[PDB]
Design a protein around this ligand. Structure first.
Ligand SMILES: CNc1cc(F)cc2cc(C(=O)N3CCc4ccc(C(=O)NCCn5cccc5)cc4C3)[nH]c12
Ligand SMILES: [Ca+2]
Ligand SMILES: [Ca+2]
Ligand SMILES: [Ca+2]
Ligand SMILES: [Zn+2]
Ligand SMILES: [Zn+2]
Length: 229
């Protein structure tokens, strides 16, 4: 497999840190990219490929980049957001999957002027899809672990849609597998127009953190408030 050095390089590149360090003239060596990463994930800012940074880079996370072309202003311009569960993972019963997504939407519904209504139609605002490797959007998944899912900011077509890597074991996060409820709640955050948070305890923190407690943090609620009047 990849050397620690190579895993680091791929991570800094994939999540947009390499590009930002290039724009500041300092791509020659990893130090500057690592500091942007340590800042962005609230790690001690050593600028070293240290134990906390390598730990972080090995942590399963969202496939959405942390730093940086879509159409429109990346918020919804209607109250009633529709979602269509285009397909299913075989990892869970369909009713449990449907309920995991309903629960992810009820989380945001309480703190936004938006409503979420399940439909069965191609034209839903938020199309939910399970897929593996290349799955039709040219942002291919990476097999088991690493990237768990991604989503697209509000707007037309693929915009607002949420995809889940079916090379992961989907569960409710108890015993084996990733909580589909917690990953969906995070990705639906992007589907409403939220960026990653730097607050480790926040839902919109990019790394997967299993919890049984209520997942929204002040920072998530406030991010939504700074988006929707
Ligand atoms: C595979 N999916 C995918 C590929 C890609 F190349 C870009 C994006 C962006 C998203 C996304 O929907 N969101 C939700 C909406 C939003 C809105 C703004 C920003 C953003 O500002 N990024 C720049 C860095 N940011 C960090 C703190 C302040 C600036 C990011 C995001 C992230 N999904 C993406
Ligand atoms: Ca994966
Ligand atoms: Ca859409
Ligand atoms: Ca699976
Ligand atoms: Zn994310
Ligand atoms: Zn996708």
């Amino acid at each position: 497999n990849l050397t620690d050095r190579q895993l680091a390089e791929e991570y800094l590149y994939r999540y947009g840190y390499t590009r930002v360090a290039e724009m500041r003239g300092e791509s020659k060596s990893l130090g500057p990219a690592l500091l942007l990463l340590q800042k962005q994930l609230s790690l001690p800012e050593t600028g070293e490929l240290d134990s906390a940074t390598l730990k972080a880079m090995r942590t399963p996370r969202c496939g959405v980049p942390d730093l940086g072309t879509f159409e429109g202003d990346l918020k919804w311009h209607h109250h009633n957001i529709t979602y269509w569960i285009q397909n299913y993972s075989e990892d869970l019963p369909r009713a449990v999957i449907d309920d995991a997504f309903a629960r992810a939407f009820a989380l945001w519904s309480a703190v936004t002027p938006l409503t979420f209504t399940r439909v069965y139609s191609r034209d839903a605002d938020i199309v939910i899809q399970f897929g593996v490797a290349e799955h039709g959007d040219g942002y291919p998944f990476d097999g088991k672990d690493g990237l768990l899912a991604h989503a697209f900011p509000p707007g037309p077509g693929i915009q607002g849609d949420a995809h889940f890597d079916d090379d992961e074991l989907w569960s409710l996060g108890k015993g084996q597998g990733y909580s589909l409820f917690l990953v969906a709640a995070h990705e639906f955050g992007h589907a409403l127009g939220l960026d990653h948070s730097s607050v480790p305890e926040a839902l919109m923190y990019p790394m997967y953190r299993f919890t049984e407690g209520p997942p929204l943090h002040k920072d998530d609620v406030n991010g939504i408030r700074h988006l929707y009047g």
